[PDB]
Amino acid sequence: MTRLLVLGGTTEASRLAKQDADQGFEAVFSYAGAQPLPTRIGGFGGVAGLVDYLTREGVSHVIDATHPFAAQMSANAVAACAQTGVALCAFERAPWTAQAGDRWTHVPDLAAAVAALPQAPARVFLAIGKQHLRDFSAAPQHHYLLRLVDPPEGPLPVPDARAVIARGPFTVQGDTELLRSETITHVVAKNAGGAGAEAKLIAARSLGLPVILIDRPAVPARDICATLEGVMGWLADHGATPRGV
């Protein structure tokens, strides 16, 4: 009978994990690099790799609730599950939709984001965390602003840079103050994030400022579950059951 693997790295996953435990499913949870489920922390050694693991563990269903800018995992699951005949929903929160007063532009990747900043010097919230910040040195004439969950640990990759320290979950109040005091002119964001990720967008709207929005990476087709309720429905439809059935 049933045995689920949940690929995590998101709060949607964390929330899915509490359900599965609570309802008494047999499920393992998978970080790369606590949860209320047994937890596996490595990677799998590419595709198959995963196939080997899906086989030896006797996994019936996989839920890819990984981050949405973490595509190589998500696609590896697709292959491994396709080649293995193991079911697979993907629990992704639906990407953000613009609305009156937003002033958004869209770009494929980080590279395109850097290319879309203006010539004239600007003051630019890089709400990317995190990594590949290095890439914006390509436009050095801007005053950038960063939010890192850590201390810098070494200097700042970009010339005119001010960091700050990101506790979370962020809040419209906070993010608006932050942007206003820092006289931010543009925001750069990925189209992803749980928690109070959307606060910065709202604050940008409050102050009438543009966002450059990095669209999610391309990933092969797979059943998509946009909520928890759906995921659990999907699980029922595909014959999954808690302990005891």
Numbering used by the authors: 1 to 33, 40 to 251
What's written in the study?
In this paper we investigate the structure of the precorrin-6A reductase CobK involved in the aerobic pathway, there is a homologous enzyme CbiJ involved in the anaerobic pathway both enzymes catalyse the NADPH-dependent reduction of precorrin-6A5 to the dihydro derivative precorrin-6B6. We have determined the structure of apoenzyme, holoenzyme and a ternary complex with NADPH and product giving unprecedented insights into the structure and mechanism of CobK. CobK comprises two domains, a coenzyme binding domain and a substrate-binding domain, both of β/α architecture. CobK unusually comprises two parallel β-sheet domains arranged so the β-strands point towards the centre of the molecule where the NADPH and substrate bind.
The apoenzyme and holoenzyme structures at 3.17 Å and 1.63 Å respectively lack the β2/β3 loop which is disordered and the apoenzyme structure is less well defined overall than the binary and ternary complexes. The N- and C-terminal domains have a relatively small contact surface, there is only 304 Å2 of solvent accessible surface buried between the two domains in the apoenzyme and only two connections both comprising irregular polypeptide chain; therefore there is considerable opportunity for the domains to move with respect to one another. The presence of coenzyme, which buries 361 Å2, limits this movement and the presence of precorrin product provides further rigidity. The picture therefore is one of increasing rigidity of the structure as first NADPH and then precorrin binds. The CobK apoenzyme has few contacts between the coenzyme and substrate binding domains; the structure becomes increasingly rigid as first coenzyme binds and then product and this is reflected in the resolution to which the respective crystals diffracted.
